[PDB]
Design an enzyme around this catalytic site. Structure first.
Site, PDB file in Angstrom:
ATOM      1  N   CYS B 286       0.786  -1.199   0.000  1.00 33.95           N
ATOM      2  CA  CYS B 286       0.000   0.000   0.000  1.00 33.95           C
ATOM      3  C   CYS B 286       0.857   1.307   0.000  1.00 33.95           C
ATOM      4  O   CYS B 286       0.294   2.411   0.042  1.00 33.95           O
ATOM      5  CB  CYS B 286      -1.060  -0.129   1.106  1.00 33.95           C
ATOM      6  SG  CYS B 286      -2.452  -1.282   0.637  1.00 33.95           S
ATOM      7  N   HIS B 439      -0.505   8.280   6.629  1.00 34.21           N
ATOM      8  CA  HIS B 439      -1.003   7.047   6.056  1.00 34.21           C
ATOM      9  C   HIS B 439      -2.463   6.887   6.475  1.00 34.21           C
ATOM     10  O   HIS B 439      -3.325   6.659   5.641  1.00 34.21           O
ATOM     11  CB  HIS B 439      -0.167   5.868   6.523  1.00 34.21           C
ATOM     12  CG  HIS B 439      -0.632   4.563   5.977  1.00 34.21           C
ATOM     13  ND1 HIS B 439      -0.650   4.293   4.625  1.00 34.21           N
ATOM     14  CD2 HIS B 439      -1.110   3.454   6.594  1.00 34.21           C
ATOM     15  CE1 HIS B 439      -1.101   3.064   4.433  1.00 34.21           C
ATOM     16  NE2 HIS B 439      -1.407   2.543   5.609  1.00 34.21           N
ATOM     17  N   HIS B 477      -9.019   3.670   0.981  1.00 33.13           N
ATOM     18  CA  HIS B 477      -7.683   3.165   0.732  1.00 33.13           C
ATOM     19  C   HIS B 477      -7.631   2.490  -0.631  1.00 33.13           C
ATOM     20  O   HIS B 477      -8.129   1.381  -0.801  1.00 33.13           O
ATOM     21  CB  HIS B 477      -7.361   2.161   1.830  1.00 33.13           C
ATOM     22  CG  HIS B 477      -5.928   1.766   1.886  1.00 33.13           C
ATOM     23  ND1 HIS B 477      -5.079   1.937   0.822  1.00 33.13           N
ATOM     24  CD2 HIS B 477      -5.185   1.225   2.882  1.00 33.13           C
ATOM     25  CE1 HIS B 477      -3.865   1.531   1.161  1.00 33.13           C
ATOM     26  NE2 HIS B 477      -3.902   1.093   2.405  1.00 33.13           N
TER      27      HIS B 477
END
Ligand SMILES: [Cl-]
Ligand SMILES: [Cl-]
Lengths: 639, 639
Positions: B286, B439, B477
């Site tokens: 990610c 994040h 995400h």
């Protein structure tokens, strides 16, 4: 930019891995490929090692035992087992430990209809019936918790059925060698098992304790680049992710994370090296390893990393992969080979025929790693030098029609690679002491298009009789790992002075462009040692790459020139010791004593003990602080 | 290596793409995220653009028409449609155009047994029966080519059934916007459609004809880095590859090649830019976009490429992906949110709650690209500057237990990123004019571990009140594309001076480390403009990255210092024209006139007209010859 100033040279200080030819380290796989050309001691040693790997002989106290317990010398092993070893290595018919290419499972749609004549009725556990219940189905109570179901309308069931694949062959690890048995491999996809086992082989081939290497660099100066192009598509990875529910069960907690194409890389950081350094997984279809290698070279020449593990792991011998490539017409089928041979009983050992009459590539599995260091660190540690890598050039194809058709980018990569080598070793050495590891994928399109590129670059640089070899003839096409199979074979040519022939072909196809190329079906030994190899690769999607590899002799001349005779002599002394340590590893490996590194859950960093300041970071377990690097890139833009 | 000499600065000259907030170019997506904080003209313009994208209004001759044909001003559109637009953008319940999260298809295993009481018999087409026929089944001839089958033993059928996912929410493109309708997208996976459409938005946002750019560099000086982490897992890609046979049919000729994780990159070279330049697809879970961005920066600073398209495309809103992440406990489930809210009827628009009470991430789709140029080329072409990117640092975690658990590498990436920024802009600017794009994945582990890293780096560098924002609160995400969503949002903060709040949380969770951080649930406007953004990212597999982005003001000061006032003034004049061209594109895009570039089968290079010499390669269609670059890296090792 503009041009790069004086820089660290990437040198190959170790290499290892596994493909259809065997163990890569110490050139054993290479030796299998040119086995008949080796002297008997080298041949018998490699055969003995294969026999142990394949469980044909038992390694007992440095000796070898037949099934009978009969002690065998390596000479006896060659006599007794060579035929079996040869038949159970390299490209060959797909063996049952993968799949049955005449009986692969799928589901047929079975449309069941009732009509006026017979009831369609069965008993079933209500928990196994569709939810919601199909509205047209009848349900009534029955005994023992079950229900009585009747169907009145056509509906579709899926039933287990078995079919034959049109493709029957693959490049398979030596029969009997099982990477998963060598460490705690529970729930790991095969590609991850292969990565872990290959990485250990590469690291141990250096003859240097990994601890010593880590102690000699900053924590951020280690880098690992690996991966696969397919993702891990077996049951334990994305196969389970994508198929579990269609087979009637839930997806597991590990199928998604262990399927990611970065996991061959991630597993090395997490379980093999314990690295907090640079990482990444670069894909470029069947040129992928060279894409990872470009990154590796760049991080060394730019000073970002000093030790780089570069490689790939691909285990694509699965029915879905085979059908997927077949559906494109990309693979050699049994029928295709029947046409080439003009008989029904095909020799699948010759499925891969680069530059010959041919009919598609052969899918293979391989995991391979090289260990690179900058020249200064190699000098300091007494690291051996198996070669040096100076450049990789990558160029796409421009506008395309079909995304998988060949294109013009490979003209650019090969031309730039050759020009770069001329700058470093000179025109004469390129003209008379270089060879090409051809992509050589065994397709009608490739044999024409690739030979035309090589022939035309040869003409531009005044090369004649340019020697060409094609590793895929031996081990098939391992996808991401393909150009690593090429690189590692190249290192063997430097070692032993043998250029492997394309032994599967009887002659070069009539449409291949040969005027300036020397393509042979026999192993060749050049009077003048080969000093430079051009690794050529391409894939679907407009992906092309060419790499430049220099021999140990060239690399040593370069280190001697830069560092001087006193420093080089000190290096030579340390290297005698590291060579002794490496040889001792090779001896253990021959005996099947591989000691795979898999450090799950051990030596974890206590994050609360990491110390961060404005000058450096101290990382638990690393003797060297990570000192932030002074930047001069943009100094003229400041103040 | 040792240290890098003076170098080209990577400047951001364009950006574009699509996520749950809308069109990225010209900061429209950013504006949706801070919509209530914008002035009315900017808000109404973005809303009008969303309304057109979503098919809520018809763009007719520069005006807007309701379903009635009623002409609407942008003010009328806000009144009439804002509620619908808001409800049909950002993280929300998964809509039917993806899947029904209460009814996803699978197969149950249905064990049918006969017993003493009723026959199990049916008629069937013999071609639909298993092969070979199960030995225990009875078969007899019947009418109309069919056969009469009876079963005497328990056996397993697979039957269609429907189940609910525990996860009901995702970050989805605005409802009604369909990338596939915008070009000839037949048989393309959704991720490839998104890549093609996003790439065009990014290229057109530059205000410079792509031809002009190509005419100003060598053919090998264009680079593209993109990809996905999952591969394309829908029916047209690896979903079809892995599921076709389990559903009863053959794999298509396109499912395998179009599934490869490099295809978002390959499609741009082949169909959008027509590039013969550098290419690659780098994954790091990610943190993937930052891995691609590191490569982009490096090729500019090393002089290998002058124009770089960097981005990603991920379309993972598929039942298998959702179940795969759920199986790890990674996603916010309906039950998880019920616990946080203390009620049964959950607000799925607040599924993503970075740094608040939270319970897992939300899966999203996004494709985003930035266009980078070296500073000299940007100056020459009058390219606009939206920011500059100076570094990306990547560090793994060392030894691990679970491969997906968080680890210490992100300490190193954040620390090195901050130190690098101090060297370029000074300590004061870092302390008082920098912010962090966290994040911020909305997990209990992340909110603690990430805040602890940021807090401890802040302390080391003497930062207090360090502003933190979390784009995943808005758009979820998007996996590979996650850090591109971050970067592009950051550019909006530079443009408008607004730091987006984490609006989905009511307060920061009690266990978050806040002493030196400023984490707000409201949009904030700093008195002193923010000049530097740290983009922070991580993923499974011990993947961590942090990037440094400089504002246009800082970048302009740097170009002025390096190039001087006369050259900068000439640049300013050209840039007035390129800004006018870009604005004209934005106006067309607002009207739904996107003119997606998809150049399949056109302008193909005639490979026989490529000219190769020992000095250069001439490529058909490129005005500039590819001249081999003089190498000085190893000159001291030669002669
Ligand atoms: Cl070939
Ligand atoms: Cl969070």
């Amino acid at each position: 930019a503009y041009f790069q100033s004086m820089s660290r040279l990437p040198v190959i200080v170790g290499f290892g891995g596994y493909n259809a030819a065997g163990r890569s380290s110490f050139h054993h796989g290479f030796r299998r490929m040119v086995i008949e050309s080796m002297d008997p001691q080298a041949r018998q040693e490699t055969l003995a090692g294969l026999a142990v790997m394949m469980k044909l002989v038992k390694a007992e106290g440095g000796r070898y035992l037949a099934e009978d317990g009969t002690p065998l010398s390596p000479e006896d092993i060659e006599r007794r087992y060579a035929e079996r070893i040869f038949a159970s290595t390299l490209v060959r018919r797909i063996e049952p430990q993968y799949l049955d290419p005449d009986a692969v499972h799928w589901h047929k749609v079975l449309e069941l209809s009732p009509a006026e004549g017979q009831a369609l009725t069965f008993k079933a556990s209500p928990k196994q019936l569709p939810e919601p219940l199909p509205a047209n189905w009848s349900i009534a109570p029955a005994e023992d918790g079950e229900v009585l179901v009747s169907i009145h309308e056509r509906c579709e069931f899926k039933v287990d059925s078995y079919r034959a694949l049109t493709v029957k062959s693959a490049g398979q690890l030596p029969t009997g060698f099982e990477p998963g048995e060598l460490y705690n491999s529970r729930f790991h996809p095969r590609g991850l098992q292969m990565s872990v086992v290959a990485a250990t082989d590469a690291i141990r081939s250096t003859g240097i304790d990994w601890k010593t290497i880590v102690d000699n660099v900053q924590p951020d100066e280690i880098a690992v680049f690996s991966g696969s192009i397919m993702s891990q598509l077996d049951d334990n990875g994305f196969g389970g992710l994508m198929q579990s529910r269609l087979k009637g069960h839930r997806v597991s907690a590990k199928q998604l994370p262990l399927g990611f194409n970065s996991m061959p890389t991630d597993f090395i950081n997490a379980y093999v090296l314990g690295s907090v350094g640079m990482t990444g997984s670069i894909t470029g279809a069947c040129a992928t390893f060279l894409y990872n290698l470009q990154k590796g070279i760049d991080v060394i020449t730019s000073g970002q990393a000093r030790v780089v593990i570069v490689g790939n792991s691909e285990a694509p011998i699965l029915p879905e992969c085979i059908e997927g490539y077949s559906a494109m017409g990309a693979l050699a089928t049994e029928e295709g080979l029947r046409l080439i041979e003009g008989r029904d009983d095909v020799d699948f050992r010759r499925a891969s025929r680069p530059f010959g009459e041919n009919c598609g590539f052969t899918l293979a599995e391989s995991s391979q790693y090289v260990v690179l260091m900058d020249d200064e660190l190699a000098l300091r540690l007494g690291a051996d030098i198996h070669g040096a890598v100076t450049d990789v050039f990558i160029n796409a194809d421009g506008f395309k029609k079909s995304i998988s058709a060949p294109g013009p980018g490979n003209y650019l990569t090969v031309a730039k690679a050759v020009a770069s080598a001329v700058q470093i070793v000179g025109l004469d050495t390129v003209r008379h002491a270089s060879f090409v590891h051809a992509h050589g994928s065994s397709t009608p399109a490739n044999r024409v298009t690739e030979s035309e590129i090589l022939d035309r670059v040869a003409s531009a640089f005044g090369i004649d009789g340019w020697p060409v070899t094609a590793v895929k003839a031996y081990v098939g096409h391992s996808l991401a790992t393909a150009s690593a199979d090429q690189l590692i074979s190249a290192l063997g040519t430097f070692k032993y002075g043998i250029l492997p022939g394309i032994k599967t072909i009887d002659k070069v196809a009539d449409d291949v462009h040969q005027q300036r190329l020397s393509i042979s079906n026999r192993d060749m030994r050049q009077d003048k040692p080969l000093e430079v190899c051009f690794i050529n690769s391409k894939g679907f999607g407009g992906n092309n790459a060419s790499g430049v590899v220099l021999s140990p002799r060239i690399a040593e001349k370069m280190l001697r020139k830069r560092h001087g005779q006193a420093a080089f002599a000190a290096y030579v002394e340390k290297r005698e010791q590291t060579r002794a340590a490496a040889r001792a590893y090779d001896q253990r490996a021959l005996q099947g004593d591989l000691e795979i590194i898999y450090n799950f859950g051990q030596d974890l960093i206590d994050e609360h003990a990491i110390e961060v300041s404005a000058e450096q970071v101290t990382v638990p377990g690393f003797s060297q602080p990570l000192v932030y690097k002074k930047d001069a890139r943009f100094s003229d833009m400041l103040d």
